[PDB]
């Protein structure tokens with residue numbers, strides 16, 4: 001399909017490919033894109049199939065599809081980029097670093113989906129394995145409580161009112177998410193590029209222990225995990241940590257350029 005793709009800035013320090021999460025879109029990352037451009041990076045943004053300004057039934061895609069999109073972006077750029085992904089997008093960039101290990105300069109994962117939420121019952125995981133096979137196009141609610149996204153009430157309100165944000169997830173995408181969560185841990189030793197993981201300690205959408213386990217599972221030496229005490233799933237707009245969170249990402253990318 002014809003996706004929504006956009007390039008921002010001049011890639012004096014290289015490229016950073018931005019990979020958004022489930023139900024959102026790349027337009028929510030204007031602040032980070034501006035900061036990265038200001039530091040000398042180009043940013044390549046896209047909206048997943050079924051998300052944002054891209055076409056397709058809402059929420060109907062897969063982690064594998066996103067990785068193929070990343071393949072295409074790296075072919076277009078003609079050089080190794082950094083990857084930045086959040087939530088579903090954080091899981092995706094970790095899986096990309098595992099399955100295309102020599103194609104990137106490094107990977108930054110914000111709240112990557114590496115552990116099941118306690119709000120997601122175990123039978124829902126088993127159901128997704130079935131529905132992903134027999135009714136892959138079936139569209140269901142993602143179960144997300146927006147109040148769990150951020151300690152910033154205005155950020156939560158914006159998310160709710162954003163017309164590009166949706167709560168759909170297909171059977172195919174649900175199956176892909178839980179399957180790739182498992183594989184992300186099993187294949188952790190395949191990563192060769194430097195890694196930065198960023199988590200909020202109060203995140204129950206993607207429990208931080210998933211990142212903590214991954215950090216220990218990684219074999220690459222240049223690995224870093226940063227915790228933000230009290231932050232929810234989205235640290236970007238957190239009142240206490242939003243600015244620091246942005247700064248850590250930029251500083252890490254600058255130091256690895």
Ligand SMILES: CCCCCCCCCCCC[N+](C)(C)[O-]
Nearest residue numbers: 022087088113128142170171174
């Ligand atoms: C498809 C069968 C039922 C699937 C619905 C279960 C909800 C899955 C929530 C996925 C959340 C992944 N996330 C947002 C943390 O990245």
